[PDB]
Design an enzyme around this catalytic site. Sequence first.
Site, PDB file in Angstrom:
ATOM      1  N   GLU A  43       0.820  -1.212   0.000  1.00  0.00           N
ATOM      2  CA  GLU A  43       0.000   0.000   0.000  1.00  0.00           C
ATOM      3  C   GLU A  43       0.856   1.264   0.000  1.00  0.00           C
ATOM      4  O   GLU A  43       0.580   2.211  -0.738  1.00  0.00           O
ATOM      5  CB  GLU A  43      -0.939  -0.008   1.201  1.00  0.00           C
ATOM      6  CG  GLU A  43      -2.107  -1.017   1.153  1.00  0.00           C
ATOM      7  CD  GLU A  43      -3.127  -0.717   0.054  1.00  0.00           C
ATOM      8  OE1 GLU A  43      -3.909  -1.534  -0.299  1.00  0.00           O
ATOM      9  OE2 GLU A  43      -3.124   0.437  -0.502  1.00  0.00           O
ATOM     10  N   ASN A  81      -7.555   9.473  -5.542  1.00  0.00           N
ATOM     11  CA  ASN A  81      -8.400   8.579  -6.328  1.00  0.00           C
ATOM     12  C   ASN A  81      -9.220   9.362  -7.343  1.00  0.00           C
ATOM     13  O   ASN A  81      -9.409  10.574  -7.229  1.00  0.00           O
ATOM     14  CB  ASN A  81      -9.325   7.768  -5.409  1.00  0.00           C
ATOM     15  CG  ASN A  81      -8.540   6.949  -4.384  1.00  0.00           C
ATOM     16  OD1 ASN A  81      -7.641   6.225  -4.744  1.00  0.00           O
ATOM     17  ND2 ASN A  81      -8.870   7.087  -3.118  1.00  0.00           N
ATOM     18  N   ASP A  99     -12.364   9.385  -7.827  1.00  0.00           N
ATOM     19  CA  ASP A  99     -13.586   9.952  -7.290  1.00  0.00           C
ATOM     20  C   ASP A  99     -13.329  11.199  -6.477  1.00  0.00           C
ATOM     21  O   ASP A  99     -14.284  11.757  -5.940  1.00  0.00           O
ATOM     22  CB  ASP A  99     -14.353   8.919  -6.446  1.00  0.00           C
ATOM     23  CG  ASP A  99     -13.611   8.470  -5.194  1.00  0.00           C
ATOM     24  OD1 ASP A  99     -12.496   8.927  -4.937  1.00  0.00           O
ATOM     25  OD2 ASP A  99     -14.157   7.630  -4.458  1.00  0.00           O
ATOM     26  N   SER A 146     -11.524  11.280  -3.695  1.00  0.00           N
ATOM     27  CA  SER A 146     -11.069  10.943  -2.362  1.00  0.00           C
ATOM     28  C   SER A 146      -9.549  10.751  -2.396  1.00  0.00           C
ATOM     29  O   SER A 146      -8.929  10.684  -3.462  1.00  0.00           O
ATOM     30  CB  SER A 146     -11.781   9.695  -1.843  1.00  0.00           C
ATOM     31  OG  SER A 146     -11.418   8.561  -2.605  1.00  0.00           O
ATOM     32  N   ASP A 177      -6.171   8.637  -0.276  1.00  0.00           N
ATOM     33  CA  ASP A 177      -5.735   7.560   0.611  1.00  0.00           C
ATOM     34  C   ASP A 177      -4.509   8.021   1.396  1.00  0.00           C
ATOM     35  O   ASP A 177      -3.608   8.642   0.834  1.00  0.00           O
ATOM     36  CB  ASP A 177      -5.358   6.294  -0.163  1.00  0.00           C
ATOM     37  CG  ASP A 177      -6.529   5.637  -0.890  1.00  0.00           C
ATOM     38  OD1 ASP A 177      -7.685   5.820  -0.531  1.00  0.00           O
ATOM     39  OD2 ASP A 177      -6.270   4.893  -1.843  1.00  0.00           O
ATOM     40  N   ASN A 213      -8.850   5.567   3.318  1.00  0.00           N
ATOM     41  CA  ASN A 213      -9.519   6.403   2.326  1.00  0.00           C
ATOM     42  C   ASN A 213     -10.431   7.447   2.973  1.00  0.00           C
ATOM     43  O   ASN A 213     -11.179   7.147   3.908  1.00  0.00           O
ATOM     44  CB  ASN A 213     -10.314   5.500   1.380  1.00  0.00           C
ATOM     45  CG  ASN A 213     -11.067   6.269   0.355  1.00  0.00           C
ATOM     46  OD1 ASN A 213     -12.241   6.565   0.536  1.00  0.00           O
ATOM     47  ND2 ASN A 213     -10.407   6.607  -0.730  1.00  0.00           N
TER      48      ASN A 213
END
Length: 129
Positions: free
Chosen positions: A35, A46, A48, A50, A52, A59
Site C-alpha cells: 500500500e 483517487n 472519485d 477521495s 488515501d 480512504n
Amino acid sequence: KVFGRCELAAAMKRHGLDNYRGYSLGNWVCAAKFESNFNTQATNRNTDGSTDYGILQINSRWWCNDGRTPGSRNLCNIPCSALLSSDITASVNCAKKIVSDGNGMNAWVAWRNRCKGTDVQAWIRGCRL
Ligand SMILES: [Cl-]
Ligand code: NA
C-alpha cells in the site's frame, strides 16, 4: 517515517494487530508494503476525488476527514493528516474498525491482489518479535 520490515512488524504486534480478526501479522506487514512501501507519509488521490493516507492507505471517503471529500463519512473520527504520523497508533486503530466492517482485509486492494493466498509468514521471517 519509512519503517523497516521487522521494525513495523514489532510496532503492529505491540498495537494488537497480530491475529486481529484472524489475520496473522504477516498479512498486515504485506499490506503495508504494497500500500505505502512502509512510508507513513504516503498519499494517493483517487478518481472519485477521495484520497488515501498513510501506511495503510486509508480512504477519506469513509474513514477520515480531509476537508475536501464532499459527502464523505469520517467513521474513524479523525483528521486524515493524523494518519501520516510516525506514530502508527491512529492508523492501527482505524484499520481495526475497517477490518471489522464485513469484508475483512479485502478492503485493501493491494492485500487482495498481492498478499491474499501467498506465504505471508515470509514478511516476518527473521524478525525478533
Ligand atoms: Cl475475515
Ligand atoms: Na471523510
